[PDB]
């Protein structure tokens, strides 16, 4: 069971690494096995298909997001750090929405992904409502704040893919904490 | 002089009509012939203004860069508010200009206008960063590298445009003028000391 659980996480970790390096469409299950160091059938014990790996990566991501919500200012900062690190993975998951999530592939896992996304959406909304009630955020509809947070994250991901970022902007790590601070502070009363 | 006034007024009608057809049907579907027929003019006439669609594309982008330049030639807090209003007005044109960057700017089409475009963009970059530096010096913005504020402003605009295009988000936000102003506030206030 140790063998199973430890190897499984290594599958997922290698699979994501290959996806971001080479494009998810070019990466087969064959290739993930070679990189981990196991054979083909050893993988099928874990994931019946690459779509199962796709959904498991997204499911694990939503569960890490859920575990964040279990002080509110520190929480809001951690939420922006979580969303904004690994921009390449974020962009991979958006492609997966059209390619796998909006299809009949692995329906059991897709059903489970919708459910935890809806509960995570309600968790963020509840944080917003609490920070309005504390006087931290401006008293506007909570979806003003939710959409503003979606926009900052989405624009930040595009920024990290932009030729200006790659080549002109120097202190990228200092910038990162600057943008997280911006997220915590936007909409402040 | 009347002849110059009328030739220009027609030129603007062609550009206003072209942009409207681009945003309505997708820019690849729209031909110079469709633009000329919509304005009510012939083939040869529209050729007097633009030899090709790609010239219209680049003119639309140049005119946007010239609008941005005029904005900086106007207090700085009001200016920062006007900058974000200018950038977040017409989200559909922003997304068109993003497709045009790959389709016409980063190619060998209309090389004289593209060269022009990069020079005015360089000037607009300097003008925006100058505004940031003056707001830092006036104690409005945190004293961090000016390119931090520039990139934050780039991210907010880009995501706000994406917001307006996602089908999930148009329904969650019923109040579109109210939200836009909340977003305006956010832009002016972000990076504040």
List its salient traits.
mainly alpha, 10 helices, 189 residues, homodimer
Total tally of structural domains of chain A: 2
What kind of assembly state do the chains in view correspond to?
Answer: homodimer
In whole angstroms, the N-to-C terminal distance of chain A is: 51 Å
Shape of chain A: globular
Structural class of chain A: mainly alpha
> Helix fraction of chain A?
over 70%
Strand content of chain A: under 5%
Total strands of chain A: the figure is 0
Continuous helix count of chain A: 10
Largest sheet report of chain A: none
Mind telling me the C-alpha Rg of chain A? 19 Å
Biggest chain contact: A-B, 33 and 29 residues
Provide the succession of SSEs of chain A: HHHHHHHHHH
PDB class: transcription
Keywords: TetR, transcription regulator, DNA binding, transcription
Assembly: dimeric
Entry title: Crystal structure of Pseudomonas aeruginosa PvrA (SeMet)
């Amino acid at each position: 069971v140790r063998e199973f659980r430890r190897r499984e996480q290594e599958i997922l970790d290698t699979a994501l690494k290959l996806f971001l390096e080479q494009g998810e469409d070019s990466v087969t299950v064959e290739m993930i096995a070679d990189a981990v160091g196991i054979g083909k059938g050893t993988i099928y014990k874990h994931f019946k298909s690459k779509a199962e790996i796709y959904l498991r990566l997204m499911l694990d991501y939503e569960r890490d997001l859920a575990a964040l919500f279990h002080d509110k200012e520190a929480l809001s900062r951690a939420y922006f750090e979580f969303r904004m690190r690994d921009p390449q993975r974020y962009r991979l998951f958006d492609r997966l929405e059209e390619k796998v999530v909006k299809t009949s592939q692995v329906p059991e896992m897709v059903e489970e992904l919708h459910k935890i996304r809806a509960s995570n959406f309600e968790r963020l909304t509840q944080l917003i409502k609490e920070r309005i009630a504390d006087g931290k955020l401006e008293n506007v509809p909570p979806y003003f704040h939710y959409c503003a947070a979606w926009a900052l994250v989405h624009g930040a991901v595009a920024l990290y893919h932009s030729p200006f970022w790659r080549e002109v902007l120097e202190d990228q790590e200092g910038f990162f904490h600057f943008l997280m601070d911006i997220g915590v502070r936007m909409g402040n009363k």
